[PDB]
Amino acid sequence: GHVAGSMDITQQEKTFAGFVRMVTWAAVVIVAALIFLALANA
Amino acid sequence: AHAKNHDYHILPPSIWPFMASVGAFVMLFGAVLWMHGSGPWMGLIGLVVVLYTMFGWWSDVVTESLEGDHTPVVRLGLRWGFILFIMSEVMFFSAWFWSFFKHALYPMGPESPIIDGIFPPEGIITFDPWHLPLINTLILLCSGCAATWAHHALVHENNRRDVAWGLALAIALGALFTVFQAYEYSHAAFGFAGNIYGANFFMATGFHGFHVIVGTIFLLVCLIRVQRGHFTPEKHVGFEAAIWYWHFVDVVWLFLFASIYIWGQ
Amino acid sequence: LEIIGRPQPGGTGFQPSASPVATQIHWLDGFILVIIAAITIFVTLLILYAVWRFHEKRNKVPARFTHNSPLEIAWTIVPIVILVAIGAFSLPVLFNQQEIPEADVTVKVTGYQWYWGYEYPDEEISFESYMIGSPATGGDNRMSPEVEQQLIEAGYSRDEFLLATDTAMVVPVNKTVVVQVTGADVIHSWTVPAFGVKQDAVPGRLAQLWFRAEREGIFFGQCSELCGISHAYMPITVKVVSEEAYAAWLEQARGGTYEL
Amino acid sequence: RGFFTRWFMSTNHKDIGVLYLFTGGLVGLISVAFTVYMRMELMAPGVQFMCAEHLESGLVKGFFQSLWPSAVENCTPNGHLWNVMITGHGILMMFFVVIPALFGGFGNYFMPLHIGAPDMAFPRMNNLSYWLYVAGTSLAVASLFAPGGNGQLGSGIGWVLYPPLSTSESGYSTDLAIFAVHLSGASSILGAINMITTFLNMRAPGMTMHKVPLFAWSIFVTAWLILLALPVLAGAITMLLTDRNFGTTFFQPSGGGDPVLYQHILWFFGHPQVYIIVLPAFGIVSHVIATFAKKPIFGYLPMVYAMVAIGVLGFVVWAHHMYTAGLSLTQQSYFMMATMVIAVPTGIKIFSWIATMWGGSIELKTPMLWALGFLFLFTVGGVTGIVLSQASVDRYYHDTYYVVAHFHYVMSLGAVFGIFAGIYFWIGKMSGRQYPEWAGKLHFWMMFVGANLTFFPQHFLGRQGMPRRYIDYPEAFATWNFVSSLGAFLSFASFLFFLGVIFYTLTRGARVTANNYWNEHADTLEWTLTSPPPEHTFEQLPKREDW
Numbered sequence A: 001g002h003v004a005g006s007m008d009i010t011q012q013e014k015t016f017a018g019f020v021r022m023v024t025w026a027a028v029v030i031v032a033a034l035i036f037l038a039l040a041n042a
Numbered sequence B: 001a002h003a004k005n006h007d008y009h010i011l012p013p014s015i016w017p018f019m020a021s022v023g024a025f026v027m028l029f030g031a032v033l034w035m036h037g038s039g040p041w042m043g044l045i046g047l048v049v050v051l052y053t054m055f056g057w058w059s060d061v062v063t064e065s066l067e068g069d070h071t072p073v074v075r076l077g078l079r080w081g082f083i084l085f086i087m088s089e090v091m092f093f094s095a096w097f098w099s100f101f102k103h104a105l106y107p108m109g110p111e112s113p114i115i116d117g118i119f120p121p122e123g124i125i126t127f128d129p130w131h132l133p134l135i136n137t138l139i140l141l142c143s144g145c146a147a148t149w150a151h152h153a154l155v156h157e158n159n160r161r162d163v164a165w166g167l168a169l170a171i172a173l174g175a176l177f178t179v180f181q182a183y184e185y186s187h188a189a190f191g192f193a194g195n196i197y198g199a200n201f202f203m204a205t206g207f208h209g210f211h212v213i214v215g216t217i218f219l220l221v222c223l224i225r226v227q228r229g230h231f232t233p234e235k236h237v238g239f240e241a242a243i244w245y246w247h248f249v250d251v252v253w254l255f256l257f258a259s260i261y262i263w264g265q
Numbered sequence C: 001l002e003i004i005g006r007p008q009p010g011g012t013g014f015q016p017s018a019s020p021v022a023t024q025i026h027w028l029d030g031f032i033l034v035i036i037a038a039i040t041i042f043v044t045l046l047i048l049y050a051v052w053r054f055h056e057k058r059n060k061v062p063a064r065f066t067h068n069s070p071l072e073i074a075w076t077i078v079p080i081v082i083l084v085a086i087g088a089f090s091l092p093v094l095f096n097q098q099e100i101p102e103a104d105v106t107v108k109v110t111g112y113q114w115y116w117g118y119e120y121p122d123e124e125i126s127f128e129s130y131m132i133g134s135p136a137t138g139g140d141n142r143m144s145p146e147v148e149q150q151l152i153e154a155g156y157s158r159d160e161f162l163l164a165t166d167t168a169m170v171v172p173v174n175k176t177v178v179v180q181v182t183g184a185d186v187i188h189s190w191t192v193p194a195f196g197v198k199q200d201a202v203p204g205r206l207a208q209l210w211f212r213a214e215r216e217g218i219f220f221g222q223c224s225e226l227c228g229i230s231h232a233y234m235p236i237t238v239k240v241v242s243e244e245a246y247a248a249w250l251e252q253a254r255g256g257t258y259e260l
Numbered sequence D: 001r002g003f004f005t006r007w008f009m010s011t012n013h014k015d016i017g018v019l020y021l022f023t024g025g026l027v028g029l030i031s032v033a034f035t036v037y038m039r040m041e042l043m044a045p046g047v048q049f050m051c052a053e054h055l056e057s058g059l060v061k062g063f064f065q066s067l068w069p070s071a072v073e074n075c076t077p078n079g080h081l082w083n084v085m086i087t088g089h090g091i092l093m094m095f096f097v098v099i100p101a102l103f104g105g106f107g108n109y110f111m112p113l114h115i116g117a118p119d120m121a122f123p124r125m126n127n128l129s130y131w132l133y134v135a136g137t138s139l140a141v142a143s144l145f146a147p148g149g150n151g152q153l154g155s156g157i158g159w160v161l162y163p164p165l166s167t168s169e170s171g172y173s174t175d176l177a178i179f180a181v182h183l184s185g186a187s188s189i190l191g192a193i194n195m196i197t198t199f200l201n202m203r204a205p206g207m208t209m210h211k212v213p214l215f216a217w218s219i220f221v222t223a224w225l226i227l228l229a230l231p232v233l234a235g236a237i238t239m240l241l242t243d244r245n246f247g248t249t250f251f252q253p254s255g256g257g258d259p260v261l262y263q264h265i266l267w268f269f270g271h272p273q274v275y276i277i278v279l280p281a282f283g284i285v286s287h288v289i290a291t292f293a294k295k296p297i298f299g300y301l302p303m304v305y306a307m308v309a310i311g312v313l314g315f316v317v318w319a320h321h322m323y324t325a326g327l328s329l330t331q332q333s334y335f336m337m338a339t340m341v342i343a344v345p346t347g348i349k350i351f352s353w354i355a356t357m358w359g360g361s362i363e364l365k366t367p368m369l370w371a372l373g374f375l376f377l378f379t380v381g382g383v384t385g386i387v388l389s390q391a392s393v394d395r396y397y398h399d400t401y402y403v404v405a406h407f408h409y410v411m412s413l414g415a416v417f418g419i420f421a422g423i424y425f426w427i428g429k430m431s432g433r434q435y436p437e438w439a440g441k442l443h444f445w446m447m448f449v450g451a452n453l454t455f456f457p458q459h460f461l462g463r464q465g466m467p468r469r470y471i472d473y474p475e476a477f478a479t480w481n482f483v484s485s486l487g488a489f490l491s492f493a494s495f496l497f498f499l500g501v502i503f504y505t506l507t508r509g510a511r512v513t514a515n516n517y518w519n520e521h522a523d524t525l526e527w528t529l530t531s532p533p534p535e536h537t538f539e540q541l542p543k544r545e546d547w
């Protein structure tokens, strides 16, 4: 019953793509914020 | 699995984990004794064991991919996990960078915190950013470019001589950074004990260097793999992590460089 | 001797209001407590109610709703309005206590492991206070005939054991006192519940805190920040006296004698 | 199946789940024990038990005498004992106990089943998780026997290790505890990674993120916090280790250091910790409310989003734990305001629960009682936190017993409830042996009774100013103490009850033969399987309709 590699991974590949995008958004949002703060109150 | 319908990897038992947890316990407890007047022997034993563990464990990692366990999803699973690892790494450095930035902005002085002191600390001699610093930054940027060039060849042209060529170049430039780094210590104008700037300056680049070494080692592994023909354009996970990781190091150094050499002078 | 600000056996409230900030602190907590008193009660009453009104034998069949928009909105605004409120009556009480006035006197309090360190920069006065049981005064931090007697002679009673100090820090009624706290060695914290004030002595740091008493007496504060073994052995005592006897205190504390 | 094969070389995520449970039980007990000791001494004024004199006697010797009163007169107040105890508790409890049952015992085992995945993404790694957790514990415990401050053994510093106290304290005791904390960090960060890959990658076809059980979302948010918060705490404590072993001066004013930054670096991770502890609890509650009120969990998206809500705010409210350690007014406001915000998200969770019960039929089974206690007490707790959130009020409250109560109400009467909630509800599924519906009730009633006694009095003490971590206190404070202490014994009783109840059940319990012993409304995939589930759950992937 071996069929290595013939499973459907459509849903995971879409997931990772989202994951990828979500983090980038996050990261950049923080740095922005950090910078803001800096500017505002450092 | 007798009759599965899924590509996920299920694993036979494995002692490695337990082994490594004893090695570390011993490692650290020996490491506590050794910073308390007593003898090294216990410490190195701990690490010796851990290092035996890790090698195995990772050897087996490869072995398991060779038995065709690394199906399409599996491959993605590892990719992902490794990425959380660099996320974590990024957080750790956020501690060290957080001290630097606070002290650099609000250094302690006799009226702190109504009033702040001065940074860099009185009688501290910050290094010259364009003399050696830039050197080490060109050295990594370059290596970066030489390690990625390996990557693309392999995946894009399937050129393997070129692939190992990029890797050696990249590996020997990583070590060079180390060598130059150490020079910097040798010629440091301030000390490590008794003065915030030394602790920050040293622990921070101290941690980064740690990683370069790790990085340069990792790569070494790939070259070896690449020499015994362990990589194809479709299957090449060690390689993917490698290049991802080397890049994170470089990023961290570049921010250091901007944060402690260039911006803190 | 008027011993006012002190714990009262079996007490479940606060300590007498010795000053404006205390005054407001009690009021703030009061007001905040009923607002959450009502929330808590409220939240149980539904729980109970529902548990019985919809216990299986009372309603054999379950319902299938999962969403009621109008109600969710209600329960997300409500709280929000609640919090704002609290805001309205909270910031102000933080600002009055963190924005420090022109002083009428000024001490400097230095947390030393296992004792405090008072200074009156204008009056060139500097002395230290220790508990009566401190090994500094023969004892090992626990009642003993000696201790009992020592305290009687102090003007205190057997029961104020762990609060009395060999050395009081005297102070003027109606006068504004600014206390600049710092630690000597590790981290301590100085504080006087009746004044409604408290703060941490920290190595390498000058922190400021202001207080005004409206009335005379002996108020008592304890070290609040794990600073080692005798962490429960560094009482704080503050005296507040008339201004005519404050001045004579000055002169009398110049001769090396540091007691009132 | 070698016994050594099975537990010592585990690759299966249901066994690792069990290992963490008992492991975490164990330590809890040990820790819990330290709790009676304290209560004992705090029952009444003066120092009757922690005398200096017992130090002359070998450890074997004085130990036993320490469980028996001495007269004030002949008792020599050894504060250091008390400090070392207090910290035995705290360190054990937030790092060895409660996060390893609730995150690595119930999560490891079940989060996977609920999504309908074969096993966790990284089995070998996971086993390594469980073992690092032991070292952690062991170093941590060993520390109570090594060269401590004041010539005694043991580090009497604080669950969090603040300096300079933590950096000046003699011996190497604290070095062990520092490294313990690291190995624990390690553990959760391996754990964390594994569940994050697992849950996004291995769910079943047709299972969308918006189609996942509460409980696994809870572990998901939990895991993210972990990932982003332990790292920062590795750093903090590295600075404490290099200051004491490499004469650095991070938080040493003589070298330009600043003890307060430490508090910033450690509470930025010391806030995320609680949201890890309760997260999972919220998860197990939903299940249990869902199943026993035989009705779908109200407002499922909002629940999920609530959870994300909290976790994110959880990184931007850490100076609430520093309201008196010397902060700008602008810093107190920002931290007071933003910390108040978390209310929104939690209430939503609290209301939804009450609204789940509303209009469903209810089954007061053991499991449910906990879940309902939890709704109550966690609210109790909660409110306090708002009172503590107001810098203003904090002055008077900070460091006093008023804050002790607020954490125990949401921890001991909160997350803890969850733990048990989880336990009763899933004991057959993972054992093939059900427990006694009487005992359970009894246990739940004792514990609620005595744990209320334990901590409710502590609110009084807090407003009557009794300071924290004192080994003795004034005459005025005897009354309540008594009560409290009494309280504690009762609860300690109970915990004993439970262990036996547990023991019995795993001995003489009702063999379980149904795949769902509860009722139709417990709908996730754990219930489709045997009772005690197969070694390889989900070789065949759970068909879409299956649930």
Ligand code: HEA
Binding pocket: C039, C043, C079, C080, C082, D159, D274, D275, D277, D278, D320, D321, D322, D323, D339, D340, D342, D343, D344, D346, D347, D348, D350, D378, D379, D381, D382, D383, D385, D386, D388, D389, D390, D394, D397, D398, D399, D403, D406, D407, D410, D411, D415
């Ligand atoms: C999991 C454990 C846990 C949880 C879940 C919480 C949750 C909260 N905690 Fe805390 N807390 C601790 C564990 C926890 N805490 C610990 C251990 C300490 C001490 C650490 C140490 O020093 O060692 C501590 C300390 C602590 C302090 C500092 C005390 C000091 O100065 O020493 C503060 C101050 O703001 C605080 C606040 C809060 C708040 C606002 C919440 C919020 O999460 C509460 C939210 C819940 C509700 C708000 C109720 C739900 C809402 C409704 C039912 C709506 C109706 C009510 C309203 C709208 C108001 N906690």
Ligand code: HEA
Binding pocket: D021, D022, D024, D025, D026, D028, D029, D032, D035, D036, D038, D039, D042, D086, D087, D089, D090, D091, D093, D094, D097, D098, D101, D158, D159, D160, D404, D408, D411, D412, D416, D419, D420, D451, D454, D467, D468, D469, D470, D488, D491, D492, D495
């Ligand atoms: C959530 C963690 C946790 C838990 C469960 C407890 C449980 C208890 N704790 Fe506490 N405690 C802390 C965390 C916890 N504690 C912390 C962090 C501090 C501050 C430390 C410091 O200053 O550094 C503290 C402090 C503290 C103090 C005062 C410290 C002082 O003077 O400054 C007291 C005082 O009486 C106390 C009492 C108790 C009691 C009676 C119990 C319980 O015995 C009461 C009821 C609970 C039970 C009877 C059992 C619960 C059992 C489990 C949850 C088992 C889990 C394993 C399995 C379920 C399989 N604790």
Ligand SMILES: CCCCCCCCCCCCCCCCCC(=O)OC[C@H](COP(=O)(O)OCCN)OC(=O)CCCCCCCCCCCCCCCCC
Binding pocket: A026, A030, A033, A034, A035, A037, A038, A039, A041, A042, B101, B254, B255, B258, D228, D315, D316, D328, D330, D331, D334
């Ligand atoms: C490739 C070459 C590389 C070159 C790159 C060049 C670009 C350089 C990039 C550098 C970025 C570093 C930024 C440094 C941050 C400085 C900002 C700061 O520290 O301000 C703190 C702010 C002010 O401090 P304060 O004490 O008020 O000072 C008052 C003086 N009058 O403090 C306050 O006002 C108190 C307010 C508290 C508010 C808390 C807000 C939270 C902060 C962000 C949330 C963190 C959550 C992150 C989550 C991580 C996980 C996702």
Ligand SMILES: CCCCCCCCCCCCCCCCCC(=O)OC[C@H](COP(=O)(O)OCCN)OC(=O)CCCCCCCCCCCCCCCCC
Binding pocket: B051, B054, B055, B058, B059, B061, B062, B065, B066, B070, B078, B082, B085, B214, B217, B218, B221, B230, B231, B232, B235, B236, B237, B238, B239, B241
């Ligand atoms: C002075 C000299 C002294 C030197 C002492 C020597 C001791 C030796 C230590 C070296 C360790 C060896 C490292 C090699 C690890 C990589 C394993 C690997 O590449 O296989 C994993 C897999 C590859 O699969 P794939 O590439 O798809 O297969 C293609 C084949 N067709 O891809 C994967 O599964 C991904 C796995 C990623 C590896 C994780 C790395 C992250 C951990 C970093 C922690 C740092 C540890 C350093 C130790 C310090 C002690 C604390």
Ligand SMILES: CCCCCCCCCCCCCCCCCC(=O)OC[C@H](COP(=O)(O)OCCN)OC(=O)CCCCCCCCCCCCCCCCC
Binding pocket: A013, A016, A017, A020, A023, A024, A027, A028, B083, B086, B087, B090, B148, B151, B240, B243, B244, B245, B247, B248, B251
């Ligand atoms: C300012 C914040 C910066 C934070 C530092 C983060 C360092 C980033 C690491 C850089 C290394 C990347 C160099 C790429 C060279 C070769 C590898 C590569 O190109 O991987 C491509 C991959 C796309 O993957 P994919 O096509 O989806 O795979 C099969 C899809 N089914 O694309 C990937 O998945 C790459 C994965 C590596 C991720 C490393 C860790 C990411 C962590 C979050 C950092 C995000 C940074 C934010 C940037 C701001 C941009 C505005």
Ligand SMILES: CCCCCCCCCCCCCCCCCC(=O)OC[C@H](COP(=O)(O)OCCN)OC(=O)CCCCCCCCCCCCCCCCC
Binding pocket: A027, A028, A030, A034, B090, B093, B094, B097, B098, B101, B102, B103, B106, B113, B114, B251, B252, B253, B255, D264, D327, D328
């Ligand atoms: C590694 C390769 C690239 C680098 C990766 C890491 C990037 C890190 C960049 C920044 C990291 C955090 C830097 C924070 C700077 C804050 C400086 C500071 O300490 O502010 C002072 C304030 C307290 O000042 P105080 O002493 O109390 O008052 C005196 C005023 N007279 O202190 C405060 O109120 C706190 C200030 C805000 C605290 C911010 C902490 C958040 C840490 C998480 C950072 C998230 C990194 C995400 C990276 C994205 C990658 C994909």
Ligand SMILES: CCCCCCCCCCCCCCCCCC(=O)OC[C@H](COP(=O)(O)OCCN)OC(=O)CCCCCCCCCCCCCCCCC
Binding pocket: B009, B020, B024, B050, B053, B054, B057, B058, B061, B064, B078, B080, B081, B082, B083, B085, D121, D122, D123, D124, D125, D126, D132, D182, D183, D185, D186, D189, D193, D230, D231, D233, D234
């Ligand atoms: C609080 C912050 C403290 C910092 C410590 C952080 C972690 C320490 C642990 C070191 C080792 C973990 C390295 C993590 C890299 C993981 C990257 C990843 O996703 O690896 C995937 C691979 C999968 O594992 P597996 O279950 O075997 O799956 C087989 C599928 N073919 O996973 C692997 O290849 C696993 C390899 C593990 C290597 C063995 C070493 C164990 C080390 C424990 C010592 C911890 C002490 C940390 C000291 C740092 C102090 C700052």
Ligand SMILES: CCCCCCCCCCCCCCCCCC(=O)OC[C@H](COP(=O)(O)OCCN)OC(=O)CCCCCCCCCCCCCCCCC
Binding pocket: A011, A012, A014, A015, A018, A019, A022, A023, A026, A027, A029, A030, A033, B086, B087, B088, B090, B091, D200, D207, D208, D209, D210, D221, D224, D225, D308, D311, D312, D315, D316
């Ligand atoms: C401002 C200061 C802030 C302070 C820091 C705050 C961080 C708190 C961290 C909490 C982590 C919670 C993450 C939960 C995100 C969930 C969102 C989600 O699930 O959206 C649904 C979307 C829909 O996909 P759909 O197809 O409908 O269903 C799946 C079918 N395959 O699903 C997708 O597209 C996939 C979703 C994947 C989940 C992403 C998880 C990553 C989130 C963490 C951000 C990390 C920031 C890192 C910063 C440091 C980096 C070095």
Ligand SMILES: [Ca+2]
Binding pocket: D040, D041, D042, D043, D044, D045, D046, D047, D048, D049, D471, D472
């Ligand atoms: Ca006693």
Ligand SMILES: [Cu+2]
Binding pocket: C111, C112, C113, C114, C187, C188, C189, C223, C224, C225, C226, C227, C231, C234
């Ligand atoms: Cu003190």
Ligand SMILES: [Cu+2]
Binding pocket: C188, C189, C223, C224, C225, C226, C227, C228, C230, C231, C232
């Ligand atoms: Cu103290």
Ligand SMILES: [Cu+2]
Binding pocket: D270, D271, D318, D320, D321
């Ligand atoms: Cu908090």
Ligand SMILES: [Mg+2]
Binding pocket: C189, C224, C225, D398, D399
């Ligand atoms: Mg404090």
